[PDB]
Amino acid sequence: RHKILHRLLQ
Amino acid sequence: RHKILHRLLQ
Amino acid sequence: HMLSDEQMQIINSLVEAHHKTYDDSYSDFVRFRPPVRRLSMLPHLADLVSYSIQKVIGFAKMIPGFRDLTAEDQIALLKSSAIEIIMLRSNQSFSLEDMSWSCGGPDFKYCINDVTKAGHTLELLEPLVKFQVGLKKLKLHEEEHVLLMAICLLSPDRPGVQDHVRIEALQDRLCDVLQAYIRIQHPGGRLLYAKMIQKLADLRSLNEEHSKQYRSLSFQPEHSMQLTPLVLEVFGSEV
Amino acid sequence: HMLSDEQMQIINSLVEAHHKTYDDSYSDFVRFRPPVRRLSMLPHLADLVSYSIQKVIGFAKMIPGFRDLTAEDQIALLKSSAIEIIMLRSNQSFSLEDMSWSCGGPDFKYCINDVTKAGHTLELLEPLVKFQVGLKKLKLHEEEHVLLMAICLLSPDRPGVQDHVRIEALQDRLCDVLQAYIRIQHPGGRLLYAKMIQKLADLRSLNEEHSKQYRSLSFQPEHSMQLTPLVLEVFGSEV
Ligand SMILES: CC/C(=C/C=C/C(O)(CC)CC)c1cccc(OCc2ccc(CO)c(CO)c2)c1
């Protein structure tokens, strides 16, 4: 998944 | 799952 | 008439457990991520709510009959009544004067706006305060407040409860200790019991609205990353 | 000889990005859950590490060539080099005098024991300090420290990298800017470049040991509930 990471990698 | 909850319900 | 041993014993357990899981000084609030008045209040309230959940669990494990239920029902009840039990126990710090939860100096004295900075709107915050006020005015005894929470947590009508029959039973045995207590020990509680049961219904509306606003919040990773592992587990949906 | 435009430009980007993601005053540490000297230091260090991760991501997005890689490789590299980049950037606050990371008053000046209260042992904490010291002594220039991190983060030999070929390429283009920089701009760096590449190898041992101790920690829900959603995501294993 990696919601947060995907999001932070804008 | 509920790792934490199971654990806290000792 | 008068209360029986088993009845009075339930009261001693409940009242002692509430004392064991609630501090009228809120000394542990300094260990939370500091508050900030973009959802600046999120970090602090996530810790406040995560903290409370642990306290409700410590309290729930001490309710007579809870420990017996299966691990799944204990979890089903907590996961769906948590937010409501928190709203109930939070009333203890609410103040009809300032219309805010006074837990500390200007720092820990939360207003309606402060919760808006957590990601909530008036559509929830408005009825919440109305409920907080309506409840505060009932000047409940410590034994009625403690019983009310125990009753709220033993609702057999929660999404996930399987043994909804024994849970139903434990709740009736408690509504009794309460009805018998209001009638024997509370001078003027002729209408009380009904008003208390009604507060339980208002909590469903509140518990419902919160659920929607929180779902929105949790869907946005920039915000969910501010929450705590416990909060995410209790309010997230996992079979 | 001398550096070229593309080479010098990589240096300006890297050095400007490190400045944009690192504060020599650590003003954001007050927003962390306060430290406490049973793993009393866990809450504070989880927030310190969660905070750093965000900073490494902000830095990584600014490394020349990173943005081009696929979302999965950007993630694969971060997830496996995070802990190492943090150890590298943390050296900036390390002090050979007290042998501790001085980020603030007695409060934010972390000793080896303080990290033991986070769940780590000397088996990791010992080599960590040895590495911290060995590195501090290299009195690296800001351009060599920044390049070293960019190089460490572009290791094509990370568990999860698929396009391990372009990642390999971007790292060679950086080891060049560094080797050319030490040789042109760093008086006395004849052995330097090699020592720097060696520090990268020590980080694997460290990154490895930490991984074991952290896995143990994360397996215990009483402790994992202290971590942050981000930390759990970067250090947890999910395809
Ligand atoms: C809806 C309730 C609510 C949830 C919002 C947070 C999230 O939904 C994220 C948006 C979940 C992290 C919020 C709204 C109003 C007041 C409030 O806090 C009263 C405070 C809480 C608890 C206690 C004791 O347990 C006291 C002291 O008695 C005071 C919390």
Ligand SMILES: CC/C(=C/C=C/C(O)(CC)CC)c1cccc(OCc2ccc(CO)c(CO)c2)c1
């Ligand atoms: C192994 C490294 C480590 C991880 C432990 C935490 C967990 O593994 C939980 C146990 C993960 C939550 C720990 C050990 C030693 C020192 C340390 O912190 C140096 C500090 C960090 C960062 C910066 C800047 O990014 C500065 C200022 O330069 C200072 C952290």
